[PDB]
Design an enzyme around this catalytic site. Structure first.
Site, PDB file in Angstrom:
ATOM      1  N   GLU C  51       0.809  -1.220   0.000  1.00 28.11           N
ATOM      2  CA  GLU C  51       0.000   0.000   0.000  1.00 28.11           C
ATOM      3  C   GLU C  51       0.842   1.270   0.000  1.00 28.11           C
ATOM      4  O   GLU C  51       0.657   2.146   0.845  1.00 28.11           O
ATOM      5  CB  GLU C  51      -0.979   0.018   1.173  1.00 28.11           C
ATOM      6  CG  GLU C  51      -2.081  -0.993   1.055  1.00 28.11           C
ATOM      7  CD  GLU C  51      -3.059  -0.637  -0.047  1.00 28.11           C
ATOM      8  OE1 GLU C  51      -3.289   0.567  -0.278  1.00 28.11           O
ATOM      9  OE2 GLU C  51      -3.593  -1.564  -0.694  1.00 28.11           O
ATOM     10  N   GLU C 127      -4.706 -10.993  -0.962  1.00 33.22           N
ATOM     11  CA  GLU C 127      -5.734 -10.948   0.070  1.00 33.22           C
ATOM     12  C   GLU C 127      -7.080 -11.337  -0.526  1.00 33.22           C
ATOM     13  O   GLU C 127      -7.490 -10.776  -1.542  1.00 33.22           O
ATOM     14  CB  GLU C 127      -5.867  -9.549   0.692  1.00 33.22           C
ATOM     15  CG  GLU C 127      -4.727  -9.082   1.587  1.00 33.22           C
ATOM     16  CD  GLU C 127      -4.970  -7.703   2.174  1.00 33.22           C
ATOM     17  OE1 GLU C 127      -5.955  -7.046   1.777  1.00 33.22           O
ATOM     18  OE2 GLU C 127      -4.181  -7.275   3.043  1.00 33.22           O
ATOM     19  N   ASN C 194     -10.891  -8.830  12.847  1.00 37.34           N
ATOM     20  CA  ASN C 194     -10.452  -9.578  11.661  1.00 37.34           C
ATOM     21  C   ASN C 194     -10.106 -11.033  11.978  1.00 37.34           C
ATOM     22  O   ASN C 194      -9.009 -11.513  11.689  1.00 37.34           O
ATOM     23  CB  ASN C 194      -9.272  -8.879  11.005  1.00 37.34           C
ATOM     24  CG  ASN C 194      -9.640  -7.534  10.473  1.00 37.34           C
ATOM     25  OD1 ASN C 194     -10.691  -7.371   9.863  1.00 37.34           O
ATOM     26  ND2 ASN C 194      -8.795  -6.545  10.722  1.00 37.34           N
TER      27      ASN C 194
END
Ligand SMILES: [Mg+2]
Ligand SMILES: [Mg+2]
Lengths: 613, 204, 205
Positions: C51, C127, C194
């Protein structure tokens, strides 16, 4: 364009091609084509042959075209459509999602071809969507993948015109002849039609489906704006008028016309004015069509090219149809239940447990009592390549014949009589068995309203071992013959639950003879789908169903072979069905009905209301 | 809701009570339901439901009914799928067999309190002295349904008296692949326009 | 394995990476990884960062790994997962049948990636299948396409263990704390779980 080579009989199919003794006789049919057809501006793709195996000669002529004319590509099919003798991939009859493997010549899935290791070429289909009898089912799934993926390009449809020959009888009237009826041996007796039109010419019903998915404009709705996008490559929109119409249950409220001009590959947004909202119940429908105002060389003035329909915001009914002041009366016997109301009356046979006779007048409404139905006449896409000598177990007609759908029969279980305060309720259950194994179960309830209408509820239940049935519904034989029929639903052509992307929801009116579509090979025809109101003569039917009314029966279409030997029976046979099976298909010898549209829930439900006047 | 019609009927071996309902909001009619009650002579009850959904409002969550039983037992017995939980989009893991568990394993305490513990595809339900037959989805819990929506933590829940029981006919898949955009796929939504279900209540 | 780079806050997300004043401070976090973890037999794929946009520096370090150790591939995600700074395609959170377009960074469908003009590399997801609360729905549709197509390879599931912290009340009994309840501003209050198991450990359903 194409040369003249086919060797589809030898064993294996590359004997006369790989052997190099036949190179001179085979290389005098490609050379003398190119020297005849090379000045014209229309031909863009050369092709060597079809269904002739792979060998060394098809590699030998390929450089001979690609060395004396470099401005066009070369295409070849047989051997798996991947080899060195082609430039664009062209399998025949390849499916869309599922795949089937063969030894040494697979047919992979159309999205799976492009992702194999080391593959870069495009893909244009050489043959797809075989079209004998009722066909072109599942056609809408090709034209989503043709627009989403970049590198697929489209295909070719087999076949355009029938191959029939004429012959005269002793009366002088003609009838279309087919296959091996002249007096030859052997023959193949159905594979000569392959029709998208007849041999007159006069169009099939199956064409107006293929008109719709191939249109040059695409539409999309958002809020109160409509969006028009184009598909041309070179032309500007010179003469096009848009034509919009809003509709509530067959009664118009608003319409209008907007002139149109779009760039190639562009977009245009069109803003709709305010539309009046109604007060009673109904679903508001919106229909948009595209009209050309002037006459070109290939069309007249007023041609139609594109349309689209949507569902708008709606309102649902609140009040109740109650009430009336008439009360039905009933009385019992050992064979018949007699339920009367003023002039109109109803009778119930005990042993069949069925509606025996319904009355208006002093007039026989019916002959054959009201009975369930679980099958259809076998179409062409489920007869396979089976015949009376050689059988094949994978076809649908042999599995149904093997289990015993056509042979089985009912046995009654229970019928009870009930009297409410405003109605009467008669309950009846049935079961179908065969050779000691129980096939099917059904339970139904009959309710007789005080107004004059009838309410019928059906619960069916299907075993999980026998293969999946054709239709779930009921049929009867009415006694009067009228001129026109009136239905509220989809139209104007026929449509099936797998081929319904072409119609629009509107009122329609036609006389009787257009409902029967005479194929040359007589089979099932003429079901209308998605309708909500049915009106014929003095009778009325409400609910949500599928129907067909015909002059002919159902058994006689299965028995005979030709179309000139049918005779008209007396009365009108009427057939109403709840749930129905898609027809496919993409081949005609293997089954090709996709798995999503089969009938495998295990439990089902439907409801309908009979009504007079 | 607002009531419309209830009628009383007497058969030869049973009685039939018919009732219709409708749900409105701000003058616009949302949902329609019609149900029939039949009382058998053996001791069991037969209930048939017909629901009808308008086509403009977005698609609803579940279609079913719920109640509050007064006795508390130790174990539950269901005939269907098990032993974990499963939803109509996550059901590829179970097997169809008999199962038995005590009460506290049915409640799955997440740290953020929300809906939990529906069992799917079952054909027989047995709890305490009661009996339910048909084809349905169910969850029995100690907690209510509103209090799971209101609070925030998992240590602040208190036990209510009795047992809340919830039986449902048709249900929505949960997804998903993101958490900020909607990601429930279109095949498993609830958009038919008409629906049907049937169930039978029974004692002992 | 992975170096230590993330710049998910700046506007746009390639300010501190494309500007070459930050090349020395950024090239002391990749070099000193490779000299620590190169004898082990377990690591098979290096990865630069996550990212942090696209720029010139992520092209600059890529030949530095591919010139001092040639026996492993190099993977990088951000910017659309197609650029020159990678060898295996790795989008995050890409769907299976439908697709959604964005300006300048699309996420095409997973069967549509491989058929674009001039594309040959494999595809391993970085992901997929976010798993907070009741989740992992629609998981069975991935594992049909993973076995039918030859060139897809599989993916990685976010995330394994919860991130909870403990705190004591006046009774002495504990309760699992989450997000911004300690007394800080600002906070995000649900995106810290998560979870595929709890924090004990004890398995989820
Ligand atoms: Mg041939
Ligand atoms: Mg981040």
């Amino acid at each position: 364009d194409e040369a003249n080579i086919e060797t589809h009989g030898m064993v294996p199919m590359n004997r006369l091609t790989d052997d190099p003794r036949w190179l001179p006789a085979m290389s005098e049919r490609v050379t003398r084509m190119v020297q005849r057809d090379r000045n014209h501006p229309s031909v863009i793709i050369w092709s060597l042959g079809n269904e002739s195996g792979h060998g060394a000669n098809h590699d030998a002529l390929y450089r001979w075209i690609k060395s004396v004319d470099p401005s066009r590509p070369v295409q070849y099919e047989g051997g798996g459509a991947d080899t060195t003798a082609t430039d664009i991939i062209c399998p025949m009859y390849a499916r869309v999602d599922e795949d089937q493997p063969f030894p040494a010549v697979p047919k992979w899935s159309i999205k799976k071809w492009l992702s194999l290791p080391g593959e870069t070429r495009p893909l244009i289909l050489c043959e797809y969507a075989h079209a004998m009898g009722n066909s072109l089912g599942g056609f809408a799934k090709y034209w989503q993948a043709f627009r989403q993926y970049p590198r697929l390009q489209g295909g070719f449809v087999w076949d355009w015109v029938d191959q029939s020959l004429i012959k005269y009888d002793e009366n002088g009237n003609p009838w279309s002849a087919y296959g091996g009826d002249f007096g030859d041996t052997p023959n193949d007796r159905q594979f000569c039609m392959n029709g998208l039109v007849f041999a007159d010419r006069t169009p099939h019903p199956a064409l107006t489906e293929a008109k719709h998915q191939q249109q040059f404009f695409q539409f999309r709705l958002s809020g109160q704006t409509i969006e028009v996008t184009s598909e041309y490559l070179f032309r500007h929109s010179d003469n096009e008028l848009l034509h919009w119409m809003v509709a509530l249950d067959g009664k118009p409220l608003a319409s209008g016309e907007v002139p149109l001009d779009v760039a190639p590959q562009g977009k245009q947004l069109i803003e709709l004015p305010e539309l009046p909202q109604p007060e009673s119940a109904g679903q508001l429908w919106l229909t948009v069509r595209v009209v050309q105002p002037n006459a070109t060389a290939w069309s007249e003035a007023g041609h139609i090219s594109a349309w689209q329909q949507w569902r708008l915001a709606e309102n649902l009914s609140v009040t109740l149809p109650a009430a009336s002041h008439a009360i039905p009366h009933l009385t019992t016997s050992e064979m018949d239940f007699c339920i009367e109301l003023g002039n109109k009356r109803w009778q119930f046979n005990r042993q069949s447990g069925f509606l025996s006779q319904m009355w208006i007048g002093d007039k026989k409404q019916l002959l054959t009592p009201l009975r369930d139905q679980f099958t259809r006449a076998p179409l062409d896409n489920d007869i396979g390549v089976s015949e009376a000598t050689r059988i094949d177990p994978n076809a649908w007609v042999e599995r149904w014949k093997a289990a015993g759908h056509y042979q089985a029969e009912a046995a009654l279980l229970q019928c009870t009589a009930d009297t409410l305060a405003d109605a009467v309720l008669i309950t009846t259950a049935h079961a179908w068995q065969h050779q000691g194994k129980t096939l099917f179960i059904s339970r139904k309830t009959y309710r007789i309203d005080g107004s004059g209408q009838m309410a019928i509820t059906v619960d069916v239940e299907v075993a999980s071992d026998t293969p999946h049935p054709a239709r779930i519904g009921l049929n009867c034989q009415l006694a009067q013959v009228a001129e026109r029929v009136n239905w509220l639903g989809l139209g104007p052509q026929e449509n099936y639950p797998d081929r319904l992307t072409a119609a629009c929801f509107d009122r329609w009116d036609l006389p009787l003879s257009d409902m029967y579509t005479p194929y040359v090979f007589p089979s099932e025809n003429g079901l209308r789908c998605g309708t909500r109101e049915l009106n014929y003569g003095p009778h009325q039917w409400r609910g949500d169903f599928q129907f067909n009314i015909s002059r002919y029966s159902q058994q006689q279409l299965m028995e005979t072979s030709h179309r000139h030997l049918l005779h008209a029976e007396e009365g009108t046979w009427l057939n109403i069905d709840g749930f129905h099976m898609g027809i496919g298909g993409d081949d005609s010898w293997s089954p090709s009905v996709s798995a999503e549209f089969q009938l495998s829930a295990g439990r089902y439900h439907y409801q309908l209301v009979w009504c007079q006047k």
